[PDB]
A paper describes a structure:
We have solved the crystal structures of the MyoVa globular tail domain in complex with Spir-2-GTBM and in complex with Rab11. The MyoV-GTD is composed of two closely apposed subdomains (SD-1 and SD-2). We have also shown that the MyoV-GTD links Spir-2 and Rab11 into a tripartite complex in vitro and in cells. The Spir:MyoV interaction contributes to the motor activation and to the coordination of the specific membrane recruitment of both actin polymerization and motor machineries required for force production powered by MyoV.
Residue numbers in the entry:
A (entry chain B): 1471 to 1635, 1655 to 1853
B (entry chain A): 6 to 177
């Protein structure tokens, strides 16, 4: 087989409807191999390119992009939907690059895959459109997951006490994280993207937790410091279990970790002051002084942080040149970098299941 | 993950004897030659099988330093096991075992399972604490005994396996 897909011009809207507009992420045939709609879409583009039909190439690509935009505008607040079409848009972009005919994108191609490259059309401009589209989808993905995690963080990371041995707990957050990760993995999202999403989620957890520390006196004690450190340790072990220790997610928690440490360490002598300054390099001077100010003990034999100690801290942190930041922007989104991940999938072997409702498509 | 038992285990002993690396070796198979003094309290978990049951070890870690009594109380609170660690190449850390035993008796439950651990057994050429001397002290004071090397991993799994099993014998 050639590895193309033929369809009548009158069936283009029918094609985009079932494959994009009304396609279900949890489809049995869709969960055989990842990115199947993306592969099917590209196989049609090849035939259009093979037919030297510039009008069909233009219409199909236009119908494709607009159909993806439509689903994400309708089913906007669904994680699985956004996750699925982020994965497939990227894979559709992968195909357009991998089979572009450009030497820079064919370094990992087989001899037969190179025979499947486009021969008549330069779709460089269309690849830029999808690239920018992919950015918007990722942005939308982050917003959806942020809206779910945000109400769980304060209750689960701070208020719920377990260190001494319905509302949200740490396990609630852990379960939600597992759900997010499992869905993205099932869709076969690029691992580079998954890691960036996880990093984004951990920053959200860290920033919101740390902001509450910097705003609440009833959260600044050594006991709370221990609780926070344990909670973070659970998040770290989740990262390790999921093989995500290179995602950057752990490093985003470093300001929170050092704040939890600051709550626990001694705060009286000049050695204590020097230790604090050497320890809190991921916290700003304003943040450090704030925690020391908000530090409200809950036992009898322990005194509050003196004004003399705080002055000592500010004196030592005078020569440091750091950010003036106090509260963190919990809404901040790290700029996403998109990988190019060509596959070994042989287009001539790809079959189209009957459950997709695409029988009108001829396999060329 | 699921478990049948949750055992809180604490690590105690002089600074530098290798408590934190025993933790890292057991819970994540990692070791650091350049590990620094532990700040506040650290935590790590691992589940093992004992008598067909899943036992989740919740291991607490802290520096061998002086601190507010309330923090020490919180550290020992609910602990069912304890690794009392010294450095076989540093006799002073073994001499101070009595001090840590005293802290144990002052803060821990009377039925806490205690294992005396001689760490850094890889430093054979530098041994300052005879195995027979330490074992005799352990037996005399109702402690289990083992020598480990967090560095080359010798007996680290066995140490935790044994103390978790002895706890299981008591609480199951
Ligand atoms: N040779 C050797 N060195 C070790 C061993 N365990 C720990 N160390 C070293 O001893 C130093 C103190 O270790 P650490 O775990 O931080 O001691 P802690 O204060 O009890 O937690 C570190 O430099 C470790 O690399 C061991 O089994 N053998
Ligand atoms: F210095 Be160790 F952590 F006791
Ligand atoms: Mg330590």
């Amino acid at each position: 087989f050639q590895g193309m897909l033929e369809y009548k011009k009158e069936d283009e809207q029918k094609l985009v409807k079932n494959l994009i507009l009304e396609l279900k992420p949890r489809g049995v045939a869709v969960n055989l191999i990842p990115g199947l709609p993306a592969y099917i879409l590209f196989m049609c583009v090849r035939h259009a390119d093979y037919l030297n039909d510039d009008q069909k190439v233009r219409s199909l690509l236009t119908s494709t992009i607009n159909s993806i935009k439509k689903v994400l505008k309708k089913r906007g607040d669904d994680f699985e939907t956004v996750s699925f079409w982020l994965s497939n848009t990227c894979r559709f972009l992968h195909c357009l690059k991998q089979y572009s005919g450009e030497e820079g994108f064919m370094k990992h191609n087989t001899s037969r895959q190179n025979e499947h490259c486009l021969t008549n059309f330069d779709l460089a401009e269309y690849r830029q459109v999808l690239s920018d589209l992919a950015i918007q989808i990722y942005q939308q993905l982050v917003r959806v997951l942020e809206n779910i995690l945000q109400p769980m963080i304060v209750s689960g990371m701070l208020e719920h006490e377990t260190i001494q041995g319905g509302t949200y707990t740490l396990d609630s957050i852990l379960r939600q994280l597992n759900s997010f990760h499992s869905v993205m993995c099932q869709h076969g999202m690029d691992p580079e993207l998954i890691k960036q999403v996880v990093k984004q989620m951990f920053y959200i957890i860290g920033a919101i937790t740390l902001n509450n520390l910097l705003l609440r006196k009833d959260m600044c004690s050594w006991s709370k410091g221990m609780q926070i450190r344990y909670n973070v340790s659970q998040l770290e072990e989740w990262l390790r279990d999921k093989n995500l220790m290179n995602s950057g997610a752990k490093e985003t928690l470093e300001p929170l970790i050092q704040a939890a440490q600051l709550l626990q360490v001694k705060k009286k002598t000049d050695d204590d002051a020097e230790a604090i300054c050497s320890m809190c390099n991921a916290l700003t001077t304003a943040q450090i002084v704030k925690v020391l100010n908000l530090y409200t003990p809950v036992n009898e034999f322990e005194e509050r942080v003196s004004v003399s100690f705080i002055r000592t801290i500010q004196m030592r942190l005078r020569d440091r040149k750091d950010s003036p930041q106090l509260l963190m922007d919990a809404k901040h989104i790290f700029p996403v970098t998109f990988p190019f991940n060509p596959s070994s999938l042989a287009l001539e072997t790809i079959q189209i299941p009957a459950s997709l409702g695409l029988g009108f498509i001829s396999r060329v | 993950d699921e478990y049948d038992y949750l055992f809180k285990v604490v690590l105690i002993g002089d600074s530098g004897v290798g408590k934190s690396n025993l933790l890292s070796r057991f819970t994540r198979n990692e070791f650091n030659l350049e590990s620094k003094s532990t700040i506040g309290v650290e935590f790590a978990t691992r589940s093992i099988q004992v008598d067909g049951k899943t036992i989740k070890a919740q291991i607490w870690d802290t520096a061998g330093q002086e601190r507010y009594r309330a923090i020490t109380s919180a550290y020992y609170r609910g602990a069912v096991g304890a690794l009392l660690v010294y450095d076989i190449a540093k006799h002073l850390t073994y001499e101070n075992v009595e001090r840590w035993l005293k802290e144990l008796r002052d803060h821990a439950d009377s039925n806490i399972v205690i294992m005396l651990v001689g760490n850094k057994s890889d430093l054979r050429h530098l041994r300052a604490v005879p195995t027979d001397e330490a074992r005799a002290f352990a037996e005399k004071n109702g402690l289990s005994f083992i020598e480990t090397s967090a560095l080359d991993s010798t007996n680290v799994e066995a140490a935790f396996q044994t103390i978790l099993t002895e706890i299981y014998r008591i609480v199951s």
